[PDB]
């Protein structure tokens, strides 16, 4: 649930 | 497979990096109110948090970075985020001797850095780095190379058996950027001896940038426990990735 | 300054001749205090030889006494670590602190936070192993650390000597038959490792500071002086 | 300062 994950995730 | 980065030429590498440059953000700084330790730290925290969002999307546009797995992308940014914030700040502050340009409306000297405990020692190192860039007359094409080198290199040695091809792919892009730096220095009319010397001088600065990041990380961890100014949820994630 | 007048071969042989010796640990598992005591005693004795090694680095004696103190205070743990990494190349998965003190990462778990520093050191040794680092290249990197790590916390002379060592590194690679493209690539790869050696030093400096107030093992006066210069 | 003394020798 890392914020860095989602910001890298979304497209 | 069939990496786009390995196919790029030297001039194409520069263009892609220059196109990916994040913007220079502004802060909520009001020159009317003087500085306090909580207010100045709040300004720098608010600014660094918004820059982190742009950095994460800038990293996606770095050639070769998208080819890495999500776990590797997280690891590289987690260990290099403060290094990238600092070299960008140092780059913005080249034309302002003795001053750090956090934002076009936030220009601080080493005296105003004393408003925060321990911050003055970090300000002096950032100023000395900016003087070194001015001393070397660093070029924007060289700067975007060093910033991408920091992203790919700073966390590559902190990586089991099959993922060695991922580490090898990063080193291939790192050598690609080295060819780009040499290609830049050859265009500016530098002899082969001058190209190697300037190449070494630029990469030795990254050693000091790592040193500033380690000291900066300990200072941010101090402010977290001091609880005087709250940190953003993203900065807390990036900060806890170093302990 | 006679350092700039030397040739590339005369710079290599001067650095090779100045190499400190490989010291032995105190003879004869390990607890926290026992391992930290062996490492403290070893690092303290290695520091005495490093200080004399620094005097023999071409150009280092030309600096004032204050600048010599500043450079050693900032680079001492980096120099100890890069020498440890160099000794451990022929021993993959292990750290050769001394010929009679060969440790693995499992033995690094005897001390708190020591396993993290151990893994970074082992990773650096593997990188030197994968790159086939040569002893002539190693002595140049160690001299670069001494002159560069503290040069920005102060200088034109130090940078002239640093350029001199850069000419020596390239000269060694051209002697080995590497092409021009392979020369600046290997030069970049070697210097980028110094960024991680600096990282290990800052992490190692914090660990030694925690050992100080944990007071597990008493530190020597010289080691405390080198440690207090970072806080 | 032990570092001073060791450098003077
Ligand atoms: O301790 S710090 C030294 C430099 C900065 C800094 C701030 C904003 C920015 O856009 C870039 C940088 Cl390098 C510090 C800082 C402070 C608070 C904070 O919450 C985060 C940071 Cl990074
Ligand atoms: O924390 S440390 C990581 C490596 C070492 C180390 C020890 C002895 C030596 O000859 C060389 C090294 Cl690099 C650590 C260390 C430990 C205790 C101590 O008192 C001093 C040090 Cl430097």
| Whole-number Å distance between alpha carbons of C151 and C131 | 28
Closest residue by Cα to atom 22, ligand 2, is: C43
The closest ligand to the CA of B42 turns out to be: 1
| Nearest chain C Cα distance for residue D5, angstroms | 10
**Which of the residues A3, A5, A9, A10 would you substitute to probe the B interface, choosing the one with the greatest number of B C-beta atoms within 10 Å?**
A3
| Whole-number Å distance between alpha carbons of C134 and C108 | 28
The closest ligand to the CA of B233 turns out to be: 1
Q: Which residues contact B224 (CB under 8 A, 6 or more apart)?
A: B231, B236, B239
SS3 B102: strand
| Whole-number Å distance between alpha carbons of C68 and D3 | 10
Nearest by Cα to B212 from B169, B161, B150: B150
The closest ligand to the CA of C200 turns out to be: 2
Q: Which residues pair with C98 in a beta bridge?
A: C101
Ligand 1 atom at shortest distance from the alpha carbon of B25: 10
DSSP C104-169: ETTGGGGSTTHHHHHHHHHHHHHHHHHTT--HHHHHHHHHHHHHHTTGGG--HHHHHHHHHHHHHH
Q: Pick from C127, C152, C189: which is nearest to B208 by CB?
A: C152
Nearest by Cα to B183 from C184, C164, C172: C184
Hunting for tokens 């120099």 — which residue is that? C79
Closest residue by Cα to atom 4, ligand 1, is: B86
The continuous run of DSSP H or E covering C53 comes out as: helix C32-55
Q: For B99, list phi and psi in degrees, rounded to 5.
A: -135, 145
Q: Pick from D1, D2, D7: which is nearest to C68 by CB?
A: D7
Q: Is B132 on the interface with C (CB under 8 A)?
A: yes
State the distance from the centre of ligand 2 to the C-alpha of C103, rounded, in angstroms. 12
| Whole-number Å distance between alpha carbons of B107 and C160 | 33
| Whole-number Å distance between alpha carbons of B12 and B63 | 10
| Whole-number Å distance between alpha carbons of B185 and B196 | 9
| Whole-number Å distance between alpha carbons of C172 and B40 | 50
The answer to whether B231 and B223 have CB atoms below 8 angstroms apart is: yes
Angle at CA C165, nearest 5°, toward C160 and C170? 125
| Nearest chain C Cα distance for residue D4, angstroms | 7
Cα nearest neighbour of C180 on chain B:
B192
Q: Which pairs with CB-CB distance under 8 Å and at least 24 residues apart come from B60-63?
A: B60/A8, B61/B16, B61/B19, B61/B20, B62/B17, B62/B20, B62/B148, B62/B151, B62/B152, B63/B4, B63/B5, B63/B8, B63/B13, B63/B16, B63/B17, B63/B148, B63/B173, B63/B176
The continuous run of DSSP H or E covering C52 comes out as: helix C32-55
Q: Other CB atoms closer than 10 Å to residue B97's CB: what's the count?
A: 11
Inter-chain residue contact B196 with C166, CB threshold 8 Å: yes
H-helix segments, B24-163? 37-60, 70-92, 119-136, 140-153
**Which of the residues B161, B194, B196, B216 would you substitute to probe the C interface, choosing the one with the greatest number of C C-beta atoms within 10 Å?**
B196
Q: Can you read off the two tokens belonging to residue C157?
A: 């002379």
State the distance from the centre of ligand 1 to the C-alpha of C68, rounded, in angstroms. 32
CB contacts of A2 in chain B (<8 Å) are 74, 237
| Whole-number Å distance between alpha carbons of B13 and B172 | 14
Inter-chain residue contact D4 with C69, CB threshold 8 Å: yes
Q: Is residue B69 classed exposed, middle or buried when 0-12, 13-18 and 19+ CB atoms within 10 A define those classes?
A: exposed
Nearest by Cα to B47 from B208, B209, B229: B229
Nearest by Cα to B204 from C172, C197, C173: C197
The answer to whether C88 and C121 have CB atoms below 8 angstroms apart is: yes
Report the helix count and the strand count for chain D, using DSSP H and E: 1, 0
Q: Pick from B59, B73, B233: which is nearest to A3 by CB?
A: B233
DSSP B103-130: ETTEEEETTGGGGSTTHHHHHHHHHHHH
Q: Can you read off the two tokens belonging to residue B215?
A: 């000291």
Q: For C149, list phi and psi in degrees, rounded to 5.
A: -65, -25
Q: Is D4 on the interface with C (CB under 8 A)?
A: yes
| Whole-number Å distance between alpha carbons of B167 and B27 | 38
| Whole-number Å distance between alpha carbons of C157 and C70 | 15
Hunting for tokens 């005097």 — which residue is that? C55
Closest residue by Cα to atom 5, ligand 1, is: B44
| Nearest chain D Cα distance for residue C52, angstroms | 7
Inter-chain residue contact C184 with B174, CB threshold 8 Å: no
Residue ranges and CATH numbers for the domains of chain C are: 1-231 (1.10.565.10)
| Whole-number Å distance between alpha carbons of B154 and C202 | 14
Q: Which residues contact D5 (CB under 8 A, 6 or more apart)?
A: none
Q: Can you read off the two tokens belonging to residue B70?
A: 């999500």
Q: Which pairs with CB-CB distance under 8 Å and at least 24 residues apart come from C180-183?
A: C180/B192, C181/B179, C183/B196
Q: Let me know how long chain D is.
A: 9
Distances (CA, A) of C214 to C109, C111, C210, C217, C230: 16, 11, 6, 8, 18
The continuous run of DSSP H or E covering B101 comes out as: strand B99-103
Resolution in A: 2.2
Nearest by Cα to B49 from B235, B188, B240: B235
The continuous run of DSSP H or E covering C101 comes out as: strand C101-104
| Whole-number Å distance between alpha carbons of B153 and B124 | 25
Burial B204-224 (b: 16+ CB within 10 A, else e): bbbbbbbbbbbbbbebbeebb
Q: Which residues contact B139 (CB under 8 A, 6 or more apart)?
A: B184, B188
| Whole-number Å distance between alpha carbons of B19 and B54 | 13
Bridge-based pairing state of the strands C101-104 and C94-98 = antiparallel
Annotated binding residue B218: no
| Whole-number Å distance between alpha carbons of C222 and B6 | 50
Q: Is B129 on the interface with C (CB under 8 A)?
A: yes
| Whole-number Å distance between alpha carbons of C146 and D2 | 19
């Amino acid at each position: 649930h890392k914020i860095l994950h989602r910001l890298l995730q979304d497209s | 497979k069939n990496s786009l980065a390995l196919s790029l030429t030297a001039d194409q590498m520069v263009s892609a990096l220059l196109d990916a440059e994040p913007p220079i953000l502004y802060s909520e700084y009001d020159p009317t109110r003087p500085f306090s330790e909580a207010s100045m730290m709040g300004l720098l925290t608010n600014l660094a948090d918004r820059e982190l969002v742009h950095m994460i999307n800038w990293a996606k546009r770095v050639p070769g970075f998208v080819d890495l797995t999500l776990h590797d992308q997280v690891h590289l940014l987690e260990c290099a985020w403060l290094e990238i914030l600092m070299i960008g700040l140092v780059w913005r502050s080249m034309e302002h001797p003795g001053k750090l340009l956090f934002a076009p409306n936030l220009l601080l000297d080493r005296n105003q850095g004393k408003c925060v405990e321990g911050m003055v020692e970090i300000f002096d190192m950032l100023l000395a780095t900016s003087s070194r860039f001015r001393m070397m007359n660093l070029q924007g094409e060289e700067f975007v190379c060093l910033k991408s080198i920091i992203l790919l290199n700073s966390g590559v040695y902190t990586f089991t058996l099959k993922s060695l091809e991922e580490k090898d792919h990063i080193h291939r892009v790192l050598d690609k950027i080295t060819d780009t730096l040499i290609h830049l220095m050859a265009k500016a009319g530098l002899t082969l001896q001058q190209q190697h010397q300037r190449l070494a001088q630029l990469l030795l600065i990254l050693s000091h940038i790592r040193h500033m990041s380690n000291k900066g990380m300990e200072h941010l961890y101090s402010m977290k426990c001091k609880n005087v100014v709250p940190l953003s949820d993203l900065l807390l994630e990036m900060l806890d990735a170093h302990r």
